[PDB]
């Protein structure tokens, strides 16, 4: 089956490079979707980007466009996130997700998560 | 952007009654729909694709509906297991979007 | 479900159909072709996996999705043809030979036709020519595509669609311009009057400087549709490959009949051999030598005749359509 596990640092400085690491398990990285996905506390979910693993082709939600890229390295079966200086409305609690489909919206899969609190 | 309006906020009932929560939206996303339910300190979990089709391990009581821009789920029978936020999904424009939540809670 | 440039419609033009044909593929051993088309077979206006409908490009404006079923669909090279399978872009059909191949969508007095230029001919398995399969004769592997729909015989590449505008979003009154949308979606537009400008209004709105409706652009941001890299259409300002579906119909290895020719009567001669053939279709004849010079020949015979080979001592072996090759060597019966 496939597993993810989120690994990022949880409490960061706005206005910094906001690096997480999500680990694939059980799959090969090259052949499906791999998704990032916020929550905010007292909120809802919001997207964030996407990757395809074979092409590293990417969409991103326009207003976070200009601020998040998505790598991912294929000897680590890795896909990570970069998120440029953060601001205090960034603080959210971070999924990253995967689907049984190559590709969907809906994701199969998707790891326990890890917050971020950005304070200063 | 389609924008989501979720229907009802919030909803506090007992174990085996039936409740029903609406999803709205701002166009016509024909039936390309999906809700999911929100477990506190854990991932959430499909229930619904395609705005009517069941998910494999979901309970069959879980019935949703729809069409156009109106969308239902009735929760018939309702459990202890089962009290969660609520969250439907479609998956037309890019990015997908999210509604504001659905509380339900123990009478 | 795009629309493409069919280089044949209803009447006689070049013209605009949703069931444009790309390409056709005849590499099977039946006479069965699989056609590319622009529309969705098998799939409603979400795309849900039901087998008696299907989805197309509309005519209008709005440029939503219909749905239709396949009653009212008709294959024909020559003759109508006869369906055997499709899934989305794919089709699968038995055809009679002829020099194009026609889809069609009979919807009602409106039979939005795509014919596209391949010659389709019988072909054949074996040695032996063939219109239909006889109940007897030799079994042989034979290469044809399978009917089974899940299966996989590559990939294809599809991207986001570029920009697709429209005349019917913009408006001229008095000598000004204007932009008219369609309720509850966002249309991005481009224009030039002057400095270079861009924006994002959901609404009617006046813009300023221009007097001909020649050169405002606008168009709908439409990401819910995947299109096919398809030389029809301008692409979007990146070129990445974003997701692949399957090609079915996977040409899968299966045995297949093939017909045995009648037996030749063979009389006797010194150094020499007389076969006397019949075959009321053409069938091959390929003699060789079995010594130092093969002295190969091959030929298509067709109704009765009588063919002399001389045979040597070290012998001659002979092929007779699709039988076993039967080897013969001479005596030195000297008169
Ligand atoms: C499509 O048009 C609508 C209407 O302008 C935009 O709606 C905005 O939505 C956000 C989030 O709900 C609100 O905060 C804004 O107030 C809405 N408009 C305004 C001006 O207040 C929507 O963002 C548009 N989508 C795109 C991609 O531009
Ligand atoms: C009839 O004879 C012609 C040659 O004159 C030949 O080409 C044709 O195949 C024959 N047809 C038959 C088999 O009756
Ligand atoms: C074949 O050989 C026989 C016997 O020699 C002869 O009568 C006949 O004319 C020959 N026919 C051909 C095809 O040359």
């Known amino acids: 089956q496939v597993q993810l596990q989120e690994s990022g640092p949880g409490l960061v400085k706005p206005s910094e490079t906001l690096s997480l690491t999500c680990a694939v398990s059980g799959d090969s990285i090259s052949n499906n979707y791999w998704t990032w996905i916020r929550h905010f506390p007292g909120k809802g979910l919001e997207w964030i980007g996407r990757?395809?693993?074979?092409?590293?082709?990417?969409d991103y939600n326009p207003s976070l466009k200009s601020r998040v890229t998505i790598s991912m390295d294929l000897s680590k079966n890795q896909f990570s996130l970069d998120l440029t200086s953060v601001t205090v409305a960034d603080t959210a609690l971070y999924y990253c997700?995967?689907?049984?489909?190559?590709?969907?919206?809906?994701?199969?899969?998707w790891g326990p998560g890890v917050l971020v609190t950005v304070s200063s | 952007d389609i924008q989501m309006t979720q229907s009802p906020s919030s909803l506090s009932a007992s174990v085996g009654d039936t409740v029903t929560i609406t999803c709205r939206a701002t166009q016509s996303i024909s039936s390309l729909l999906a809700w999911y339910q929100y477990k506190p300190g854990k991932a959430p979990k499909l229930l619904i694709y395609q705005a009517s089709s069941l998910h494999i391990g979901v309970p069959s009581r879980f019935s949703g509906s729809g069409s156009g821009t109106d969308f239902t789920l009735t929760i018939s029978s309702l459990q202890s297991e089962d009290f969660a936020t609520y969250y439907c999904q479609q998956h037309d424009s890019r990015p997908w979007t999210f509604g504001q939540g659905t509380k339900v809670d123990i009478k | 479900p795009y629309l493409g440039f069919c280089p044949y419609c209803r009447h006689s033009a070049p013209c605009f159909s949703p069931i444009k044909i790309e390409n056709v593929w005849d590499e099977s051993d039946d006479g069965s072709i699989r056609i590319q088309v622009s529309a969705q077979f098998g799939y409603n206006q979400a795309g849900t996996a039901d087998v008696t409908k299907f989805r197309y490009m509309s005519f209008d404006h709005d440029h939503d999705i219909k749905e239709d079923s396949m009653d009212k669909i008709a294959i024909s090279t020559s003759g109508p043809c006869r369906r055997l399978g499709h899934k989305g872009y794919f089709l699968l059909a038995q055809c009679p030979p002829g020099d194009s191949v026609t889809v069609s969508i009979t919807s009602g007095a409106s039979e939005n036709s795509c014919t596209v230029e391949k010659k389709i001919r019988r072909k054949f398995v074996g040695r032996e020519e063939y219109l239909f399969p006889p109940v007897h004769g030799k079994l042989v592997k034979c290469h044809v595509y399978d009917h089974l729909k899940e299966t996989s015989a590559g990939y294809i590449t599809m991207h986001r669609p570029g920009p697709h505008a429209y005349k019917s979003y913009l408006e001229e009154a008095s000598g000004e311009v204007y932009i008219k949308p369609p309720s509850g979606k966002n249309v991005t537009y481009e224009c030039k009057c002057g400095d270079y400008s861009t924006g994002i209004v959901s609404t009617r709105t006046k813009m300023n400087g221009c007097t001909k409706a020649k050169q405002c652009i606008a168009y709908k941001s439409d990401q819910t549709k995947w299109v096919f890299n398809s030389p029809d259409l301008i692409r979007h300002t990146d070129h990445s490959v974003q997701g692949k579906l399957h090609i079915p119909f996977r040409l899968t290895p299966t045995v297949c009949p093939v017909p045995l020719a009648h037996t030749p009567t063979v009389t006797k001669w010194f150094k020499g051999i007389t076969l006397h053939l019949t075959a009321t279709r053409p069938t091959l004849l390929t003699t060789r030598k079995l010594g130092l010079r093969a002295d190969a020949t091959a030929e298509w015979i067709t109704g009765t005749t009588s063919r002399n080979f001389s045979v040597g001592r070290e012998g001659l072996e002979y092929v007779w359509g699709n039988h076993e090759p039967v080897r013969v060597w001479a005596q030195e019966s000297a008169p």
């Open positions: 997700a995967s689907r049984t489909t190559v590709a969907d919206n809906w994701f199969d899969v």
């Open positions: 990757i395809y693993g074979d092409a590293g082709s990417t």
